[PDB]
Amino acid sequence: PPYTIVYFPVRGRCEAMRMLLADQGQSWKEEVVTIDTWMQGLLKPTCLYGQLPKFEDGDLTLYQSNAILRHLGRSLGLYGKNQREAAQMDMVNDGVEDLRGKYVTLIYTNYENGKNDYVKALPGHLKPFETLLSQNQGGKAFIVGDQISFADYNLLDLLLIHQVLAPGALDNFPLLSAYVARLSARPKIKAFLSSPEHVNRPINGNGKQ
Amino acid sequence: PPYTIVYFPVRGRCEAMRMLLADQGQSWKEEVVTIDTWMQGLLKPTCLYGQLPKFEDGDLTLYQSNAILRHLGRSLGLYGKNQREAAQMDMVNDGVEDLRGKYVTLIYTNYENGKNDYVKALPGHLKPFETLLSQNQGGKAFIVGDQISFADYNLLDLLLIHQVLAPGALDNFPLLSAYVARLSARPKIKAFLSSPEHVNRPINGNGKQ
Ligand SMILES: N[C@@H](CCC(=O)N[C@@H](CSCc1ccc([N+](=O)[O-])cc1)C(=O)NCC(=O)O)C(=O)O
Ligand SMILES: N[C@@H](CCC(=O)N[C@@H](CSCc1ccc([N+](=O)[O-])cc1)C(=O)NCC(=O)O)C(=O)O
């Protein structure tokens, strides 16, 4: 700490890290970058890869959302109890990222002509996570192990935005449905998902969801 | 150990982990999966996300090429000396993965009409790495710190395949140019690059590069 999130005024690739920080009783500063400011092209060239979010943790400045998540997981003790779990958490998080990428592509470049197809192939992309849960404590714990990890927050966010994209998304996924509800009931999470900062923030930059 | 790699008969997303292993004096098993076999539909359904590569350390089965790289780097001591370096290495690796995905799309779905534009935009995508190096001992050491990390093997592979795609891609990037020469000059790595299993193996599965 202190923690500072530099991002556009949307949930997008930052809602997961915010739930993590909130569920760990951490406070952070939000630096909102409007599209107008970004179009001026002043901040963009200063970003390592020309993109946001940008994260500041004390003297450390990071880019790449997944790198930020892993940093928080490693520093706040949300990365498993050993190398074996750490590897499994990375495997889970990479899967989460692959789906988010496709979700993003759908939202921003082909929403009206590709939603039906996307929702059609969605169960196939969610099944792996249902399987993962079934293999861990029968699915009554977390995605990996008995302790919540950064992967959980990223996966939770992914599942939540897909339930908005497709209402009955988890109908045929009992473990994932109970998983989402279980984590959403976590006091700090419930409070976060209920806060105005979160409610007032649109899921994506084009309003589509 | 023992290490087993289940992948297609290409370098693709496994050449990086392969150089890493070889450079660490490690040996492994190569289970080559041909297109024909893959189209038989027996292995795919058994893969966590329906894709390869698949990895086996003996008791632990992994998927996601970056999870594998991170796992090897973590268990073999190639993940930095502290939390700060590990975070920056992740930031590096994420950036490498971002460009690899675009590289992959070009080669497999739009090589002909997209190469011109891709190579034109390539300098802008490599610059960040040139910059990172200039901020780490003038680029005399590694991508992050002075110790080789899983991130270095991934970046090296990325730079090498782009050198074949666009000769002179590093003409305006002296630090990256040297970076590649040096690491490729490493005894274990140099031996790998000259091995028949590597030499005979195509970069991609569609004969393009
Ligand atoms: N791999 C990187 C990917 C980052 C990325 O896609 N960043 C986008 C924003 S998230 C998606 C997004 C886009 C636009 C808005 N908006 O409000 O206008 C919000 C979110 C960006 O910086 N775009 C600016 C640019 O490239 O010039 C990561 O995971 O952090
Ligand atoms: N995020 C995953 C992505 C894995 C991925 O894209 N895997 C591809 C192979 S690498 C790219 C590739 C494609 C084809 C060949 N080939 O020889 O025909 C080789 C490599 C795959 O399994 N495709 C099968 C499928 O989706 O059905 C990772 O990083 O490991």
- Cα B76 to Cα B8: distance, rounded to the nearest angstrom: 25
Hey, where are the domains in chain B? 2-78+187-208, 79-186
Closest among B199, B139, B205, B191 to B21, alpha carbons compared: B191
- CB contacts of A74 in chain B (<8 Å) are 83, 86-87
**Pairing outcome for strands A3-7 and A28-32:** parallel
The answer, yes or no, to whether any atom of ligand 2 lies below 6 A from the CB of A98, is yes
- Cα A100 to Cα A159: distance, rounded to the nearest angstrom: 10
Contact between B191 and B25 under an 8 Å Cβ cutoff? The reply is no
Residue whose CA is at the smallest distance from ligand 2 atom 30: B64
Closest among A102, A94, A38 to A65, alpha carbons compared: A94
Atom of ligand 2 nearest to the CA of B44: 27
**C-alpha dihedral sign at B151, A90, A152, A201:** positive
Q: Give B118's Cβ-side CA count (13 Å radius).
A: 20
**C-alpha dihedral, B189 to B94 to B14 to A79, nearest 10°:** 100
- Quick one: DSSP state of residue B58? S
Domain B79-186 matching CATH 1.10.10.10: the answer reads no
Helix intervals (H) in B76-173: 83-109, 111-134, 150-165
CATH number given to A2-78+187-208: 3.40.30.10
Contact between B152 and B89 under an 8 Å Cβ cutoff? The reply is no
Q: Is A7 annotated as a binding residue?
A: yes
- CB contacts of A145 in chain B (<8 Å) are none
Tell me whether the omega of the peptide bond preceding residue A53 falls within 30 degrees of 0, making it cis. Answer: yes
Closest among B92, B94, B121, B123 to B106, alpha carbons compared: B121
Give the nearest chain B residue to A70 (CA atoms): B87
Q: Is B29 annotated as a binding residue?
A: no
- B3-7, strands of its sheet edge to edge: B28-32, B3-7, B54-56, B61-63
Residue B51 C-alpha to ligand 2 middle, in angstroms?
6
Max CA distance (Å), chain A: 52
Q: Is A70 annotated as a binding residue?
A: no
- Enter the tokens of residue A208: 């589509």
Contact between A154 and A69 under an 8 Å Cβ cutoff? The reply is yes
Of the candidates B64, B74, B91, the beta carbon closest to that of A62 is on B91
Q: Is B60 close to A84, i.e. CB distance below 8 A?
A: yes
Resolution, rounded to a tenth of an Å? 2.5
Q: Is A87 close to B94, i.e. CB distance below 8 A?
A: no
Atom of ligand 2 nearest to the CA of B35: 18
Residue B35 C-alpha to ligand 1 middle, in angstroms?
35
